[PDB]
Amino acid sequence: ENNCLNAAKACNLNDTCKKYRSAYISPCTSRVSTAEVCNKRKCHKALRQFFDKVPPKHSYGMLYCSCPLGDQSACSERRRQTIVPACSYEDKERPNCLTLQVSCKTNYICRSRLADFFTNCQPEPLSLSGCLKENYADCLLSYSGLIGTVMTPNYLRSPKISVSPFCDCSSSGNSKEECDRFTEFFTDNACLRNAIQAFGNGTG
Amino acid sequence: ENNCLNAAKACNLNDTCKKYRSAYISPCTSRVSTAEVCNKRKCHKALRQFFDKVPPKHSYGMLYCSCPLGDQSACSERRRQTIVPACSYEDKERPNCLTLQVSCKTNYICRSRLADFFTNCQPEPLSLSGCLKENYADCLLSYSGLIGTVMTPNYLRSPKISVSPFCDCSNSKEECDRFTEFFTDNACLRNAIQAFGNGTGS
Amino acid sequence: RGCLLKEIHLNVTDLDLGYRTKEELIFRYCSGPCHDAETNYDKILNNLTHNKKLDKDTPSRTCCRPIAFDDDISFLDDSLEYHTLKKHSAKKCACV
Amino acid sequence: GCLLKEIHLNVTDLDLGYRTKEELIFRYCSGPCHDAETNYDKILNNLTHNKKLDKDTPSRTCCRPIAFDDDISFLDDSLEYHTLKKHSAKKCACV
Amino acid sequence: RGCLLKEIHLNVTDLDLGYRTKEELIFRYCSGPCHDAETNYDKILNNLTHNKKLDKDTPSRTCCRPIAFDDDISFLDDSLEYHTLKKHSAKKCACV
Amino acid sequence: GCLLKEIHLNVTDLDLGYRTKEELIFRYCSGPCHDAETNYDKILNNLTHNKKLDKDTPSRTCCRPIAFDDDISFLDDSLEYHTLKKHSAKKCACV
Ligand SMILES: *[C@@H]1O[C@H](CO[C@@H]2O[C@@H](C)[C@@H](O)[C@@H](O)[C@@H]2O)[C@@H](O[C@@H]2O[C@H](CO)[C@@H](O)[C@H](O)[C@H]2NC(C)=O)[C@H](O)[C@H]1NC(C)=O
Ligand SMILES: *[C@@H]1O[C@H](CO)[C@@H](O[C@@H]2O[C@H](CO)[C@@H](O)[C@H](O)[C@H]2NC(C)=O)[C@H](O)[C@H]1NC(C)=O
Ligand SMILES: *[C@@H]1O[C@H](CO)[C@@H](O)[C@H](O)[C@H]1NC(C)=O
Ligand SMILES: *[C@@H]1O[C@H](CO)[C@@H](O)[C@H](O)[C@H]1NC(C)=O
Ligand SMILES: *[C@@H]1O[C@H](CO)[C@@H](O)[C@H](O)[C@H]1NC(C)=O
């Protein structure tokens, strides 16, 4: 019925995927206090471990599952819950994107992934593919490399595919323009959108 | 209240920021002898540690806190003492800027931190942001990365926002005037510091 | 060598554990004869029970049970809520 | 629940074919193992109720011995010695 | 249980230690009943005091006190001078 | 300061319900721990003075035993033996 649900079926029937899927579900869902819903550190560490050791056919087949319209469908919601956003994505405070860029750039692994993302998922309106670098695979990996980090992205509740990190541009100051360019590279990017759709097309 | 005083409050209330803030205040405030005011080497090592362990919201919120732009404002004085400049910044002899560059370039870490500073904080009068590279964050980090080296910079007492290392310029001198001007009057650096303050304040 | 490990493919709802989900699973269990591993203790129990020397205590003879449980499984139900099960499948069997 | 019990018997009361007047003490395991229940057990109960498993009747938790008692030796009527091993329980546990 | 750590938000001036600053802090202390952890030594002390066997001394019984002190805290005063405090808050408690 | 004191007594001077004519030597801790107070103690006094900690009444330094003496046994009138443990102090310290 739903390509996104068939991806889970294939995962639980695969010993390697089944093991590591549960490995990240439990920490991201096991409460530790009335205030804390999870050990966010241990949750992210299992996510990264999931995409490292689970084969890509199964791991990415669940993250990029093809959905008719990713807005308010069962296919769209199952995909939104893949990273357990209640623990890995959301937070009590929404930071400014300048502060979130500083925090990511202090950490070496986060910096490298963020730099690879903006380089490999650069759009080009004059391109049939939409990507300036003309390689969907390189853009998908760079994006996935941000999952477990401080820049964790997740699908937004929109008609078409829209992803974002947990940051905002509340400042009315002149910095609003540079902040808008950062979020727009995530939210409205025809290269990333074509890559995600292109991968689900293949594993369908 | 001052955005700087509120930042210090938010630090003491955060266990991580409180611990490491005290970790660098003590060595920079502990006198080893009547001649030496502190173990400068241990003071710098604790500063760098403070910027590596404390989350940026607090560490950089105190350093780049927003002031009212009043000359010798309480915030500005509080912000100026952030690094304990009596131990890390000041020194008995003010070196010539050519010699200080030779010292920073002998140490691999200071050399890279300096190269990253000039590359990422290049100004551009044509750019609306003021930065040639168009990334404020990359300029703020490259700057802070110097706070624990021989090239440690700190705010100067001016009506505007001015930062400088402990150096002075006096055959050739224009190259030395270019170096000091890169810290004192850099629209890319000034606009970044006033961007973080706008974001981490109210 | 008779207590073996078998496989069965099922819905999660086939386990009747109260969940409403369309996820699937591979269930593994132990089944086989343990006549080769019986001891004097077992054949004594068989005879004593026949003689009725034991007052209806009906002690248990060798069993074909698991000695190692399988990895945990997690699934997502129809309400978009995650669940996880532990000690559900068998990884290694043995006549215990 | 799974506990160890004792009984005083003759080597003949075990009906192992021996002819002797010697005696023994036999220890066995008996008790309930509901406290040691696992999902694997429950899944087996729900599958046997239905007919998913085909004529397999797998076994749930058993109360069995985890350690056997020391060996025992006796002399029969024909002046011949016999020795029995792993015949009595030393320690029980739900398995 | 009983002996437990409790927290409070205070100005640095609320501690009344003589400092002049507007900074703030979080203070943790131990408080709770330690009746459950009394030894025969404590009972004897209570019976000796009641019967006035120990004529004058007033020995102490179990106390709910900190067994671990909190990290150090530093603040800036109105005169642009730095002060640091050690052993100001409790990190762990115990009936001892 | 916090020092150890000795006091000779009967076994019935402890009012523990025992019946015997035996005797004991009891050691307890008593002394001032003022010279071992910390900022934590000074803060508590100042907060209890201005009454910022209205409800609670936390404890300051206590001269307490850190090691208990050896065990003591005795015989009662009914020719029954009794043993006490952790009844006297061996070494003290400010806690
Ligand atoms: C997993 O479940 C599917 C679906 O269950 C079927 O539909 C339910 C509403 C209920 O009626 C169940 O009893 C059904 O078994 C199973 O696939 C179906 O199996 C039936 C029985 O042979 C068959 O008639 C259907 O065509 C199948 N497909 C459907 C309903 O879409 C399947 O056997 C279960 N086990 C697995 C997947 O291992
Ligand atoms: C061993 O067998 C003898 C029988 O040969 C058992 O002794 C009998 O016990 C019953 C019950 O007390 C008596 O009514 C019989 O008279 C006994 N027979 C003899 C010959 O004495 C004996 O109990 C058995 N051993 C044990 C441990 O039970
Ligand atoms: C910060 O805010 C002030 C007040 O609105 C504004 O004038 C200034 O340009 C802002 N600086 C930035 C966003 O860098
Ligand atoms: C801190 O200081 C202010 C000003 O004196 C006072 O009103 C407040 O009660 C103090 N404590 C807290 C927790 O704010
Ligand atoms: C011990 O008991 C006797 C009475 O039996 C009493 O006189 C004596 O005082 C007791 N011991 C001490 C130390 O008082």
Author numbering:
A (entry chain G): 150 to 353
B (entry chain K): 150 to 319, 323 to 354
C (entry chain H), E (entry chain L): 140 to 235
D (entry chain N), F (entry chain R): 141 to 235
Passage from the reporting paper:
Glial-cell line derived neurotrophic factor (GDNF) bound to its co-receptor GFRα1 stimulates the RET receptor tyrosine kinase, promoting neuronal survival and neuroprotection. The GDNF-GFRα1 complex also supports synaptic cell adhesion independently of RET. GFRα family members consist of either two or three extracellular cysteine-rich helical domains (D1-3) followed by a flexible C-tail (CT) and either a glycophosphatidylinositol (GPI)-anchor or a transmembrane domain (GFRAL). Each GFL-GFRα complex has a 2:2 stoichiometry (GFL2-GFRα2) that adopts a U-shaped structure with variable hinge angles.
Here, we describe the structure of a decameric GDNF-GFRα1 assembly determined by crystallography and electron microscopy, revealing two GFRα1 pentamers bridged by five GDNF dimers. The monoclinic crystals were grown using recombinant zGFRα1 residues 20-353, (defined as zGFRα1D1-D3, lacking the GPI-anchor) in complex with zGDNF residues 134–235 (mature form of GDNF, defined hereafter as zGDNFmat). Missing from the structure is the zGFRα1 D1 domain, which we found to be removed by time-dependent proteolytic clipping during crystallisation. Within the decameric assembly, the five ‘U’-shaped GDNF2-GFRα12 sub-complexes associate with one another about the five-fold axis through GFRα1:GFRα1 interactions from the tips of the ‘U’. This arrangement generates two GFRα1 pentamer rings (green in Fig. 1b) that form the base and lid of the barrel, connected by five covalent GDNF dimer ‘staves’ (yellow/orange in Fig. 1b). The barrel molecular dimensions are 138 Å in length with a diameter of 118 Å. Unique to the barrel however, is a homophilic GFRα1:GFRα1 interface generated by the non-crystallographic five-fold rotational symmetry. To form this interface, helices α12 and α15 from the D3 domain of one GFRα1 molecule (grey in Fig. 1d) dock into a groove formed by helix α9, helix α14 and helix α16 in the adjacent GFRα1 protomer (green in Fig. 1d). The interface includes L247/V251 from helix α12, L289/L290 from helix α14 and F348 from helix α16, together with several hydrogen bonds and charge interactions at the interface periphery. Electron density can be seen extending from the specific N-glycosylation site of all zGDNF protomers and a total of 8 N-linked glycans for the 10 zGFRα1 protomers are well resolved within the barrel structure.
